[PDB]
Amino acid sequence: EIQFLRTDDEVVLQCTATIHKEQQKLCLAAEGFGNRLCFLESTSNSKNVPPDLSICTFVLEQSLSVRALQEMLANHRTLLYGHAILLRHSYSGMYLCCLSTSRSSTDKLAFDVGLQEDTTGEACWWTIHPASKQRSEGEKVRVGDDLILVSVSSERYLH
Amino acid sequence: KAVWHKLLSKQRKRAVVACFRMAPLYNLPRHRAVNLFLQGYEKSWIETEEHYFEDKLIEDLAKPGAEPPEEDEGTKRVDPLHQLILLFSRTALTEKCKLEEDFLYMAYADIMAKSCHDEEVKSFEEKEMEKQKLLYQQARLHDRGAAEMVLQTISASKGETGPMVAATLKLGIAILNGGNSTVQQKMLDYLKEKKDVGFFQSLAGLMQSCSVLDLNAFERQNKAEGLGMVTEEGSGEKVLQDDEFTCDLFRFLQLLCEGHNSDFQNYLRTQTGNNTTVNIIISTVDYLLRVQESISDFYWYYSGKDVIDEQGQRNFSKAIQVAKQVFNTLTEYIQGPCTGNQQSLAHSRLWDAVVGFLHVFAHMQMKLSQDSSQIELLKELMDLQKDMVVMLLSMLEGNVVNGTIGKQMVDMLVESSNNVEMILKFFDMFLKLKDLTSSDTFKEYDPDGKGVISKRDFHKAMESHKHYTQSETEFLLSCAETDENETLDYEEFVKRFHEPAKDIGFNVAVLLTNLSEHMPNDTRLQTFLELAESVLNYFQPFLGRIEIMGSAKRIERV
Amino acid sequence: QLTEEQIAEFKEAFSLFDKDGDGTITTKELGTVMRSLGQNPTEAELQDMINEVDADGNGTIDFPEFLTMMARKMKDTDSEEEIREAFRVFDKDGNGYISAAELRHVMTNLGEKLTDEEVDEMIREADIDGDGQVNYEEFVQMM
Amino acid sequence: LFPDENKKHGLPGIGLSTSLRPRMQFSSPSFVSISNECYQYSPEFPLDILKSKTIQMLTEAVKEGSLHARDPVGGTTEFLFVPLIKLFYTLLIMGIFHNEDLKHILQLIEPSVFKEAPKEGLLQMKLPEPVKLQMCLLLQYLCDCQVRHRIEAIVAFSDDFVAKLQDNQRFRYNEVMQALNMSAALTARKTKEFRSPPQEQINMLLNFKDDKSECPCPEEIRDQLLDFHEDLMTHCGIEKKSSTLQQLISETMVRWAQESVIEDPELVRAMFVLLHRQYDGIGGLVRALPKTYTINGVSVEDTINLLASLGQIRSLLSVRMGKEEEKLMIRGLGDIMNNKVFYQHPNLMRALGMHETVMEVMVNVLGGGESKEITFPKMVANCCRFLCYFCRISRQNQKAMFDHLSYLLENSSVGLASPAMRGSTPLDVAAASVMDNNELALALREPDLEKVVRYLAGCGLQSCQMLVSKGYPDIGWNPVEGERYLDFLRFAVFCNGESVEENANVVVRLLIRRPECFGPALRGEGGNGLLAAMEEAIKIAEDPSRDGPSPEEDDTIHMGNAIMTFYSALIDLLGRCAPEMHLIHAGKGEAIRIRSILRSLIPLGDLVGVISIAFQMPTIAKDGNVVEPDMSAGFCPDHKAAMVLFLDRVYGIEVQDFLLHLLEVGFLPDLRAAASLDTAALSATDMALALNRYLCTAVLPLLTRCAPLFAGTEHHASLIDSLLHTVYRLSKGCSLTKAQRDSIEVCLLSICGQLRPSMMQHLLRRLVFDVPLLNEHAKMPLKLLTNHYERCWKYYCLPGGWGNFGAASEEELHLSRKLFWGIFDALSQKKYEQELFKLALPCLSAVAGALPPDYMESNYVSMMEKQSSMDSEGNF
Ligand SMILES: [Ca+2]
Ligand SMILES: [Ca+2]
Ligand SMILES: [Ca+2]
């Protein structure tokens, strides 16, 4: 009845904004050649401005667990909360990552988020967490639901 | 000389450290040693001293005393046991915010529980005598209102784990042991005719409050012994806080629906009379998913390590016992083709838990078989696998051809294909071991009955047998442990491996045959069938297959 | 009552464990020695066992307290017995005289690398008797 | 156990009891006196007359009741019996009855059972339910007396059993030690008995039971216990009159229950409790033995006083909190503290459960008037002080207090804001519970840390209500509460010099999850940084309008000092939470991640700047009195101590450029300031002491562990010379304690040894003028000279010298000759001190070896050697 987000599926990570008393839907976008840094493109103004979903679509290759990530760092599937995922940018073929090289945007704690070619390292892997209290860790992720990702390398959320 | 002084110093370091370490008891003053002796004497002797008086006390307390001798000129006097149970019931029925701990109830519930059970091949006469004695001893209590009291205490518990709840659960198990129909009927009538929602709410609260394996606490304990800290408690019960409580709580729920009590089985799923309904069937499968997740995480922690330590082995044993009890409880709810519970479990989260158990069984068996020290853990794990397959076979009860439950089950097997493949390879290998050891070529290698075969002779016997591949050869050599003489006892080897394969793989063979017959046109299933041909061919002499007219007025194969 | 050279031998034995030189054995200072001998202690075990010897209660045993624990035990003849105990076990030859050839062989156990020839230069200093092969008597001269 | 050879139970109560019991004191009720001591204690009464009349009246009541007269005394059987039996029970509890009186009054209860080798006792009289309950109470007391007699007999047996066991262990140990050697005795399984803790030794010795029989104790000693245990079992009843109180009670309770349907729930409860006690006599010992303690004869009086104080405190539970009750309980707690048994016997202290009584007395006060603020604040302080001292007494007390950690941290905010209350808050009790116990720190859980993290977040978010009510400026945060919540986290994460990584990872993760706990400066949005925060705090400290409330002095929380202490505590906590060095060498991802997170949170430049901040030196006034800068308000060396700890544990000093830059910017000025305050008058100043403590505990060991980095510093010539001169001046300083002097000696010996030979010429030109004095201060210079002249022997002897270093300039040779001659003369004309002579001889020999035998001194002498500028008078 209800679908479930599984591997090898193309999705867009969309975030909402409440700037100046209105709900604004924004999508995470990045383009391979040129600037590797990720930016946000408006999607609520689709009637006025056509969004560029080409740089917004991402592919979910693996949904391995944290222990599997630890083992492969030492060296077709349904996503479950608390697992490490590998988002691949469809257009560029470069995986999302925490660049760990901040641009010094006021808050010194945060780092920059972009695309990196190499798959090795813990920067590319991201752990999904259930925003909804009804959802639980280990439970399968619904297609329509809220997520809060955590960077393995930096222990920071996509903010 | 100076170098010699340094050389001498190295051993002199040991002397000073040794005398510092020296703490003989005689140096202690008299009072300190006397106090330590009092504590040691207490623990070693007074606590360990045991005497059996529960049956005597209950029999004396249940006797109506001299009623014809002294005339009350009133209502029939209640026996002292009846008065005690009535007091305990009234205390529970009294409205209080919390269930206060009471020593009298704690002691007397234990006494009554011991009285009920009062505990090589027993004959039929002795078995029937024991059943009659158990029935009479349980009647001695449920004729005075213990079945109602054990429900009232659980209701007043308000879903809070405590020794009071543990004693109540033990008493309930004692009175329900063997599937007491009269006690089941009394409990069900009580619950129905006073519409108790607190009982089910407290049951749900307790089942949420039940604990599982904790890698964090176990790793903290590991760091403790690694630093060298002595175990204050030998149990180390920070991991798996209350295994006894969890097992007792689930055994209570299993004995409640034993004997296929369709009425109580349905009433657990849906309390029709009550205003609010709680799904114990779904709560149980939720706890099963929690415990299987904990077990999988513990296995993942022990994946890299070559050998399992004793602490990990005992934690695995306790978790396996808990999971086995939960699986038995789920089986008893889906026994007696109870369609409602079958559908509920089919739509519930049982499938991914079984998938997880399948991976654990596939890898844990491979890991344990090589090492010869923890064969008991392997046996417990395979017993858990047997109970899981029994649960699946009960799930398939009353299934028509091309049934939806069977279809979901084949999807589960397809999802867990590789683990099923490895389990089937394991069983096929250790069942063909018997044909290998019965081959006459091996008897020609070892003509006399001493049975002391050499490693190389066994290796070339396997090649002469030719049925095994090189990978199978290496794996059997690894799983075969021999002394430095390379002298191995194939007799103990086969008695240690084949019979367990024989009596667990039968359930897998039966499940696969059932699925194959009830789905004659499922393409994916013939892959597992052709992978398990050898197991099926071995178990063909032992598999009895008949058809009967089932309770659903339809022909069923048994 | 303690014999004068025994305290002097207790002086050096005290300094053998008092690396810092202040005359106070801290728990960590004592602890590193016990790891060096192979045993792995907990901090509580070390601090528990150090309390019994500490009569003052300062947490660090001084030499006057150290003497009392030394007086607790019978080192009546254990000193030279251990000296002979080493001479017996260092006598791999068993001739009653210990050769210099295995002198380098046991000092390597601690990790020293002093050359083969130079030790028999030092054993010659030990061999004021001139034996050319060290006995217990030379060991007594050494100690 | 048994009065005579035949195993017959003695009459309950009758016997010799030696267990300590509360003292009986009474006061005469006289109203003509003008004294007030009589108000203490209960009024006197004729106890013997009351006892005799009670016995007579009970006898008459029993003899008359059996005939069932129409008119009893008072009109009813209940009125006749209940008050009289209540008075009898009270007298029996007080213990007035003795010997024949007890015999008669027990015969009045049951003639057949208690007759000593017709009329029916009280137990067969068809009594009402209140009378039955009052008789159940009497039977319970008799059973308790039997249990006490059993416990006393067990303690009697233990006296000689333990003595003979100890003698046997001495004999066995002597035989084993004759067999083996002390050095080899550390190993070998035979010595495991003696190396085991005493509790484990007794556990192994008491293996007589069953068939295993692996205990080393012989059969002659085994038989005594294998007889006493069965005697105790027989006395407990584990193996025609009933002849036993146990059987009498067991029959009576069941007979009553089957005779009548009891309506009163209390009677049913009492009867079944008593029946279970009769049928579970082993449980009585199982419960009593853990509460049984043994004391020597000398400690009896002090134990009695401690028990009286405990009784007073326990009895004050039943009365409501108030002025006089607070005074009484505070005085009693002080009495318990002053008692020596409180220290000598902590096991008895815990068995009596005084800590639970203090738990209850604190809970009552804390729960009383939560909205109207915690009334009786001195009481909470005294209770918390008693509890912290209880934790400090013994390790097991910390375990006992760890069980109430959830409540204490839930009430952690009772009195943190109020000053002068340090060590008297529930947070302090929690810190003492989880202080320096590695097992307890490991057992500490995550939600417990989360509670403290939330409290710290609130205190960093909003201001202090009490401070802004007293009139302090309303800054946007509360540093006073934070400096305590951070100290608790420090004690939780850091234990015994090592860092508990499991707790450190949780604390760091929660602190970065909620970043407002870091203070407004380090919050990250428009934050001026740690260095600017310290500068602003210094300025607000000099400003009196913002430092104080400006509407006592100890109550005055200087806002600048509070801010500075908060930031220092946060930095110290983070540095302690930093992963250990060996784990970074191993390369664990978690440790690397934590280290990187801490580096991101705190920059290097901020730490360097805060270290570069200078103090305010004390100065002498015209009159001749030193003016003392205030330490409740100002920049303190303890603040920089945490900065250096963070620098060492997080960033690490591994490069010589950074080492020298830090030495120039922050460390050397402090050394010079100490070397200037080392004057005679300024030495006793709080500044000299605090600065010396900070130096010798943080800076000097850091430079000692970073000693090898000083190898290739040829192009920094003047910096190392200044460092050596300042360190030597600090060593020559007088106010230093022994540990400080040792630290200075070790650091100077390491740095000088690692240093190049040519650089220490300026140190030699001061050492040659000081060493010949050969005073007590000259111990360290002799060793330094020995090590230097041994290491750099080729530099002086060989004409080429060290190939890279070179050779002497002949001025070093002249200085070495003067040193040699001065040392030789001073040793010649000074009195023999063995230590001085054992240290000076190697130095003299090393100098003689270093000096070439063909040495040519030059007709060069030096011009106006600046000896006066280094002489002690004025120090310049
Ligand atoms: Ca001392
Ligand atoms: Ca030799
Ligand atoms: Ca010789």
Numbering used by the authors:
A (entry chain C): 10 to 84, 110 to 193
B (entry chain B): 3584 to 3702, 3710 to 4148
C (entry chain J): 4 to 146
D (entry chain B): 1738 to 1854, 1889 to 2010, 2053 to 2364, 2377 to 2701
Authors' description from the paper:
Structurally, RyR2 is a 2.3 MDa homotetramer consisting of two functional regions: a massive cytoplasmic region, also known as the cytoplasmic shell, which comprises several regulatory domains (NTDs, NSol, SPRYs, RYs, JSol, and BSol domains) and the stabilizing subunit calstabin-2, and an activation core and pore region, which comprises the Ca2+ binding site and the transmembrane domains. Here, we solved the cryogenic electron microscopy structures of ryanodine receptor 2 variants linked either to heart failure or inherited sudden cardiac death.
Furthermore, we present the cryo-EM structures of RyR2-R420W, under conditions that resemble those present during systole, in the presence and absence of CaM, which also exhibits stabilizing effects on the mutant channels. We solved the cryo-EM structure of the RyR2-R420W channels under conditions that resemble the Ca2+-induced Ca2+ release (CICR) that occurs during systole. Here, we used 40 µM because this is the concentration at which ryanodine binding and lipid bilayer experiments result in maximum open probability, preventing RyR2 from reaching the closed or inactivated states. Compared to the previously published structure of Ca2+-CaM bound to RyR2, where the C-lobe of CaM was barely resolved, we observed a very well-defined density for the entire CaM protein allowing us to better model this unique mode of binding. Our improved sample preparation and increased resolution allowed us to clearly detect the anchoring residues W3587, L3590, V3599 and F3603 in the CaM hydrophobic pockets, and to identify the inhibitory mechanism of Ca2+-CaM binding to RyR2. Binding of Ca2+-CaM not only stabilizes the CAMBD2 helix and the BSol2 domain, but also generates a conformational change in the JSol residues 1950–1960 attaching them to both the CAMBD2 and CaM N-lobe. Moreover, the presence of oxidation-sensitive Met residues in the binding interface might explain the reduced CaM affinity under oxidative stress, preventing stabilization of the BSol2 domain by Ca2+-CaM in disease conditions.
